[PDB]
RNA sequence: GUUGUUUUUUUU
């Protein structure tokens, strides 16, 4: 947790030119990479921004986090050290009680490790949960643990066995 | 009974 940031939810048509102007506005930028699939060069939808000062980095988070750019809302946060340990940490859960909430998810899945991002898919019309959700842990061991502890078991408040697998 | 994130969080 220092100067390196990971920018998420970037519109596909965002150029390095844009990333720069946007983040440069906070303080001097060391580097700005958009991360796109080699060959086709299509944005993986995220980027890293290495500021020069730990202070500038922090402030970027405070100001740019959540700002809307065209169709998306950016999500700026400190990058976690890479590695094999961050691998296979995204979970695809289904058969979740339809009365589920972000706080229950936290209770159920938060004991096995530290959640980095979670999303309860909701019906666009009703706004009610569809029973699906994506939970992304910090370490690869937490997801594995989460999986074996919750797969095929009935969650509290529900009458149906959860389904937890790697996305 | 096949629900899939603001499709895409580790350097593409």
Written description of the protein model:
This is Protein sex-lethal. It comes from Drosophila melanogaster (Fruit fly). Residues 3-81, 89-167 form the RRM domain. It is found in: Nucleus; Cytoplasm. With 167 residues, the chain is α+β, with helices and mostly antiparallel strands. It has two domains: 5-75, Alpha-Beta Plaits (2-Layer Sandwich), CATH 3.30.70; 91-167, RRM (RNA recognition motif) domain (Alpha-Beta Plaits, 2-Layer Sandwich), CATH 3.30.70.330. The protein is 23% helix and 32% strand. The chain contains four helices and twelve strands; from the N terminus they run E-H-E-E-E-E-H-E-E-E-E-H-E-E-H-E. It has helices at 16-24, 54-64, 102-109, 140-150; strands at 4-8, 29-33, 36-37, 42-43, 46-51, 68-69, 72-73, 75-78, 90-94, 115-122, 129-137, 163-166. The protein has a four-stranded antiparallel sheet. Strands 10-11-9-12 form a four-stranded antiparallel sheet, with helices on one face. It is elongated. The chain binds one RNA strand of 12 nucleotides through residues 6-9, 11-12, 31, 33-39, 41-48, 71-75, 77, 79-83, 86-87, 89-90, 92, 94-95, 116-117, 119-121, 130-134, 136, 167.
């Amino acid at each position: 947790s220092n100067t390196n940031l990971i920018v998420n939810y970037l519109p596909q048509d965002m150029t390095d030119r844009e990333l720069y102007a946007l983040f440069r506005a906070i303080g001097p930028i060391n580097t700005c990479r958009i991360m796109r699939d080699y060959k086709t060069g299509y944005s993986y939808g995220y980027a890293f921004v290495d500021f020069t000062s730990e202070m500038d980095s922090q402030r970027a988070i405070k100001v740019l986090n959540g700002i809307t750019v065209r169709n998306k809302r950016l999500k700026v946060s400190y990058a976690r050290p890479g590695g094999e340990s961050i691998k296979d940490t995204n979970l695809y859960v289904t058969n979740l009680p339809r009365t589920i909430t972000d706080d229950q998810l936290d209770t159920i899945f938060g004991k096995y490790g530290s959640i980095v991002q979670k999303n309860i898919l909701r019906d666009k019309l009703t706004g009610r949960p569809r029973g699906v959700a994506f939970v992304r842990y910090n370490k690869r061991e937490e997801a594995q643990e989460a999986i074996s502890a919750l797969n095929n078991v009935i969650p509290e408040g529900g009458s149906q066995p959860l389904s937890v697998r790697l996305a």
